């Protein structure tokens, strides 16, 4: 692919997301989604091979079905109230269809199956984009229509997402599928607090995005897509594996690391309403994500796996391309808890 064409496609993806974020008209929001998908399909196919083509096809089918349901919900809402402005969604059937369409776009359970497959079928850069930038538009719409949400449906989907993310991640040796299941669980956490406080949703999204960016950038720096290939990195660059171990611990939600901050905050918010059983269940379930993060840390940093002879040659060369934002991303992923009250600036 031409670099000019790649830049144009990335800019079109971002423009579709921005159009979703700045629009007041439902038609313009739908157009933003369409433009984002149209530009996103070729980016997933940048390195051409059958797996990338399969991932792109599955992604297109899922997102096109979601957009059809989105448009039908908009039209039903218009039928029962001649309104185009994104507001309290005057019809409940239309609101149910809207919620299901947005959940399918986000990959929330039980519309979760496509996320591990698409993530595994594409490159690490495409996976970074898909798991970070592609969450902004549906979450922005959900934040805008939160007051009309049905808490039962969204809470059911969020709890299912957390459970399924943990259970599915428990079974993986491929790093991209691990990241996808982690994303599913974190989306569940984000949507669990949405009917109560959208500021907490934004805070969780920001912290998750920072940690995911650090994770994907560390995985690109050490060209590993499997557990066994990541188990070699200690014999080439131990600093990368140590930073990865601390980042995994933060993603597990352990204090005093930054990944503990959202869950903590969310739990507190849920106890400001009554909502006692659900946060307890959510934390006990997030223990599963912590377990498979810890297994990855065992494989890559806390023990030393056997290496190969040809690795000696790799000792003689340095990394050519350097990521300028990786150190700041790591620091923000780990040492940010003491600045928790700054979340007031989010609302």
């Amino acid at each position: 692919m031409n670099p000019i064409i790649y830049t144009t496609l990335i800019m079109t993806v971002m423009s579709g997301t921005m159009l979703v974020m700045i629009s007041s008209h439902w038609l313009l929001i739908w157009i933003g989604f369409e433009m984002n998908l149209l530009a996103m399909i070729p980016v997933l196919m940048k390195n051409f091979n059958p797996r990338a083509t399969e991932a792109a096809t599955k992604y297109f089918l899922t997102q096109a079905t979601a957009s059809m349901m989105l448009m039908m919900a908009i039209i039903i809402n218009l039928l029962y109230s001649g309104q185009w402005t994104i507001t309290k969604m005057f019809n409940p059937v239309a609101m149910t269809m809207m919620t299901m369409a947005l959940a399918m776009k986000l990959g929330l359970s039980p519309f979760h199956f496509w996320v591990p497959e698409v993530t595994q079928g594409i490159s690490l850069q495409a996976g970074l984009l898909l798991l970070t930038w592609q969450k902004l538009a549906p979450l922005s719409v959900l934040c805008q229509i939160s007051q009309s949400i049905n808490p039962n449906l969204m809470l059911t989907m969020a709890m299912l997402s957390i459970l399924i993310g943990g259970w599915g991640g428990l079974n993986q040796t491929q790093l991209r599928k691990i990241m996808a299941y982690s994303s599913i669980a974190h989306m569940g956490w984000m949507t669990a607090v949405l009917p109560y406080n959208t500021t907490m949703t934004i805070l969780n999204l920001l912290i998750y995005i920072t940690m995911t960016l650090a994770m994907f950038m560390l995985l690109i720096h050490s060209s590993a897509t499997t557990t066994l290939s990541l188990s070699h990195t200690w014999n080439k660059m131990p600093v990368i594996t140590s930073l990865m171990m601390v980042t995994l611990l933060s993603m597990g939600g352990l204090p005093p690391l930054s990944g503990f901050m959202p869950k903590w905050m969310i739990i507190q918010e849920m106890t400001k309403n009554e909502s006692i059983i659900m946060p307890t269940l959510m934390a006990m379930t997030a223990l599963l994500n912590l377990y498979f993060y810890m297994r990855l840390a065992y494989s890559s940093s806390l023990t030393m796996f056997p290496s190969t002879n040809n690795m000696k040659m790799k000792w003689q060369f340095e990394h050519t391309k350097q990521m300028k934002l990786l150190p700041t991303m790591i620091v923000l992923s780990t040492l940010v808890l003491p600045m928790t009250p700054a979340l007031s600036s989010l609302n």
Partner: protein, 122 residues
């Protein structure tokens, strides 16, 4: 739920309303600013470590820029956070003042007139 998005008079993308100028600014020795500078210094050290350069001595200009940028952003972040908390307190006090029926000050009782059950430990 969104508490403060529809608060009347809010300018969409301001980040710092003019009213916030009536609040005392954070001191330059604020411990939160010191921690932000510490975060910048840690970022510089990690940058040195990843690039296989001497961690403490490699780039002093780069480390200085890291610390300066973190402090510069942290100052305005702290200003906005303090403004938001001041706004919350202002609205809470005004609402309590305008709805006295929902916030009554009931008569005070001393502990010599309050009957509390005693539970012996044995």
């Amino acid at each position: 739920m969104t508490m403060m998005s529809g608060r009347p008079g809010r300018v969409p993308l301001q980040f710092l309303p003019n009213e916030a100028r009536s609040l005392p600014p954070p001191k330059l020795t604020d411990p939160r600013l010191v921690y932000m500078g510490f975060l910048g210094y840690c970022s510089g050290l990690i940058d040195n470590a990843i690039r296989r350069r001497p961690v403490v001595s490699a780039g002093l200009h780069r480390q200085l820029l890291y610390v300066t940028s973190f402090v510069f952003f942290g100052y305005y972040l702290l200003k906005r956070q303090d403004y938001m908390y001041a706004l919350r307190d202002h609205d809470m006090f005004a609402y309590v003042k305008s709805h006295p029926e929902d916030f009554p000050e009931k008569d005070k009782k001393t502990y010599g007139e309050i009957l509390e059950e005693f539970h012996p430990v044995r």
